[PDB]
Design a protein around this ligand. Structure first.
Ligand SMILES: Cc1cc2nc3c(=O)[nH]c(=O)nc-3n(C[C@H](O)[C@H](O)[C@H](O)COP(=O)(O)OP(=O)(O)OC[C@H]3O[C@@H](n4cnc5c(N)ncnc54)[C@H](O)[C@@H]3O)c2cc1C
Ligand SMILES: Cc1cc2nc3c(=O)[nH]c(=O)nc-3n(C[C@H](O)[C@H](O)[C@H](O)COP(=O)(O)OP(=O)(O)OC[C@H]3O[C@@H](n4cnc5c(N)ncnc54)[C@H](O)[C@@H]3O)c2cc1C
Ligand SMILES: [Fe+3]
Lengths: 454, 451
């Protein structure tokens, strides 16, 4: 009688059982991630509803997986058979914007882009800008510690989580973290929630840190290359010069030429960089970045004196994944290695394609060494699927061999549990099982993702 | 028979038992914090030695309390009777400075200022600059999540900790966190160590993120006031102008006197020292904010040296007051909008309890440091200050602040810490510590109670 207690606790408008409606609430954009039919999909109204849902599911031992917008790429939000999917679509209000403290308090259902537009009205700015910003929730960004494009100079979500309110344990609603500028009272439990991917609790309200709007001119330094190796050597060349570019992205040829077909290519690798320093200070730095592209392999390495053709190339970098998803199933990998390993990793990925006869596109946050190789899977050719799945295990192990990480921003979820286990090791994993057990003694919060419990 | 197992594990020259020597290892600069004679003070050489100390005490259930430079202000490093003090004095080497990744790898025993000067050679910079930087260890800065003067614009220690290696549990050497620029694999166990004050493990190596050197001329904006109330409104003026200053510090009268009566170098009640890191247009905007409020000799300083001399008194305020006797310090942090109100509350706590309370605070972040000098022989004033101590704290939580901003709960703040966190959150601390420290040997009893 799980659905019976839920309706009797939070009403009927907050429980859904139509197998047709629950279809889309149990899987995210991560393809090949298994997902089964959940027992019911709850859409709570406020923290009180979530507290009751967690309490009921805790006693009955029913797995509950929180869901934001369902734009994950590792199946972290995917629901298991009989689970209770908690959709925060109804908790989508920005509660306050304190201009003196320069902080904002939002609900987990808020959309990233919507949040940024609201704070910009008060002259503030929320730096984190994931490619899925137009559709991802702040709840998801906090659960997966999502990153963005400008995170090479302003950090990721974790760098802006001051405090939060979460439902944990048997249904206790607690307020973790702080709201002032400095606080060390107790443990960093608020930070412990960030990057947990909903395996330790449920965030019902988060307090974010803000910054003044950049109200300025973005000097773009555009560069083209003919090889992923040379272009990789240039990104490291700028980082060795000691420059902190406000953006440094790589878009191979296969990816950029596809976006044109959708929305309507000087070289093989397009290295897009940009700086945001005011006045000539930025122009001086943007010029320095240009030389780094020219000194290395340089094809059409020119600084952009146009505020739109620059912005048009960057809008293509954002529409790279959705432009290729319409082109068929797309398997994506997220590794992050040291900046000095970008050339070795780029040439190592390209080599991985020839060994398994699999064409692999490349886009990566060159500023942080976070590579995103994307493979478009042709339908009908199972060997290509199999060859790409084994190449999947080569790029991962190769990134761990140079000292990288199995995931940089997308989250372990399900499609990266193998690599995550090899990176963390038995001791680190054992600590995860212990931590999750103390804060989730019922084992109901998204059990089985990131790491396994046995 | 515990000391014997230790000596039989890490040699004799790494174990000390002389009760005359262990004194300097069993208590920190936090006075009135309880401390007893430890069973031995271990000075490890490498992670292997630290691993042995943890394994031995884990099986025997002997409490171990890690110690850095002993500059804590809440008794976090104070040792309990029969404990084993692990001193990282020997682990004080900078292991690597990766200029391509722009990161540094340090051991816990390294001093803050030493780490900064080291990275300065390679054109890098470590922003976090606590007042005790010249003699505090990086191991301590990570356990307490220390702050500094520039943290109003560059964050605190936790904002630069990329990864670490620690000995947890029964003595397993694990490396938490990452070393790249981005990493989200699993939980943030590294961030969990930060601010734990050594209650979940022992950090033997930390990987900190760095930034390019400033390489510019700072625009210092010095300002004088005649009261903590009027000056408080000036601090809000910079906040009401959308200005993020690289530094904003406030010092009281008795603080300045002690600095001029010690260093003998040198007029106002409070002195707000502002600074920008852009730039003259911003420094000028702040100057007008001071004259907008009660302004005495408010001038946007162009002499970078004379201003730099003024910032030496702000950092030498506590060392200049400890020479005048026992100094009990409180560390509250409230929202910026409560700085003026909170300052007026501190003054009343003095009049109400007949206690002279000096004030220095990072007004830019709302981190207040009211310090009382306790005279010798007048125990009445000591207990009277303890009552104003409970009043200034409750007023910090009532207005939405926190019991501790940068110093840490330790021991002299566990009362307020419990009131702030609450039963639910406290029950979580005992649960977390239990999972990662099933033996309960890592500084047990501090921060929260293991009742
Ligand atoms: C086209 C595209 C571009 C992308 N670009 C980026 C990018 O640039 N950077 C990046 O980091 N990621 C990117 N992603 C994936 C992205 O990380 C996720 O979309 C984003 O992190 C959040 O999406 P979401 O709102 O759907 O969260 P969801 O997928 O719903 O949830 C993700 C995780 O968070 C947990 N969770 C959700 N809500 C809550 C809550 N309220 N409380 C606690 N836990 C919760 C979920 O259970 C799951 O574990 C992209 C995805 C797509 C499809
Ligand atoms: C004069 C003065 C000025 C100060 N100014 C500031 C300031 O501006 N900002 C600020 O934030 N703080 C300040 N402090 C206190 C500051 O927190 C300490 O100076 C700093 O935290 C480190 O001191 P320490 O290295 O002696 O740490 P210790 O006191 O030795 O240790 C502090 C806590 O950390 C734990 N710990 C230490 N090393 C390890 C380790 N290797 N692994 C695990 N746990 C460990 C200790 O056990 C203890 O719990 C000041 C202190 C003084 C005395
Ligand atoms: Fe991305």
């Amino acid at each position: 009688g799980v659905v019976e207690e839920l309706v009797a606790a939070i009403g009927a408008e907050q429980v859904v059982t139509d197998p047709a409606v629950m279809e889309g609430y149990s899987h995210d954009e991560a393809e090949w991630a298994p997902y089964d039919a959940p027992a019911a999909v709850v859409r709570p109204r406020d923290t009180a509803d979530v507290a009751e849902v967690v309490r009921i599911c805790a006693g009955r031992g029913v797995a509950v997986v929180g869901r934001g917008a369902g734009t994950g790429l590792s199946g972290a939000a995917n629901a298991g058979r009989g689970w209770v999917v908690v959709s925060f679509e109804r908790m989508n209000r920005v509660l306050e914007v304190d201009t003196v403290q320069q902080t904002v308090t939002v609900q987990p259902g808020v959309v990233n882009d919507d949040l940024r537009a609201r704070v910009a009205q008060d002259g503030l700015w929320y730096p984190p800008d994931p490619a899925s910003s137009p559709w991802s929730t702040i709840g998801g960004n906090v659960a997966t510690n999502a990153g963005g494009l400008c995170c090479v100079k302003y950090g990721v979500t974790r760098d802006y989580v001051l405090g939060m309110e979460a439902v944990v344990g048997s249904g206790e609603v607690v307020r973790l973290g702080r709201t002032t500028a400095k606080g060390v009272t107790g443990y960093d439990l608020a930070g412990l929630m960030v990057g947990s991917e909903g395996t330790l609790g449920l965030v019902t309200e988060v307090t974010l840190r803000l910054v003044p709007l950049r109200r300025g001119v973005e000097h773009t330094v555009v560069g083209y290359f003919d090889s992923l190796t040379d272009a990789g050597r240039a990104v490291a060349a700028v980082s060795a010069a000691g420059i902190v570019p406000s953006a440094l992205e790589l878009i191979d040829r296969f990816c950029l030429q596809a976006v044109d077909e959708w929305k309507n290519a000087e070289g093989e690798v397009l290295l897009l960089a940009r700086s945001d320093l005011p006045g000539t200070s930025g122009q001086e730095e943007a010029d320095r970045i240009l030389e780094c592209f020219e000194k290395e392999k340089a094809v059409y390495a020119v600084r952009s004196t146009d505020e739109e053709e620059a912005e048009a190339l960057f809008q293509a970098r954002r529409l790279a994944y959705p432009a290729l998803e319409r082109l068929g199933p797309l398997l994506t990998e997220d590794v992050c290695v040291p900046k000095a390993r970008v050339p070795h990793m780029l040439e190592a990925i390209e080599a991985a394609g020839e060994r398994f006869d699999t064409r692999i596109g490349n886009i990566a946050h060159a500023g942080d060494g976070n590579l995103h190789p994307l493979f478009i899977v042709p339908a009908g050719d199972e060997e290509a699927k199999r060859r790409a799945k084994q190449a999947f295990e080569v790029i991962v192990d190769e990134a761990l061999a140079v000292g990288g990480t199995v995931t940089g921003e997308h989250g372990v979820g399900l499609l990266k549990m193998r690599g995550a286990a090899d990176e963390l090791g038995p001791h680190v994993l054992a600590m995860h099982r212990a931590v999750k057990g103390a804060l989730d003694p019922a084992g109901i919060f998204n059990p089985g993702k990131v790491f396994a419990l046995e």
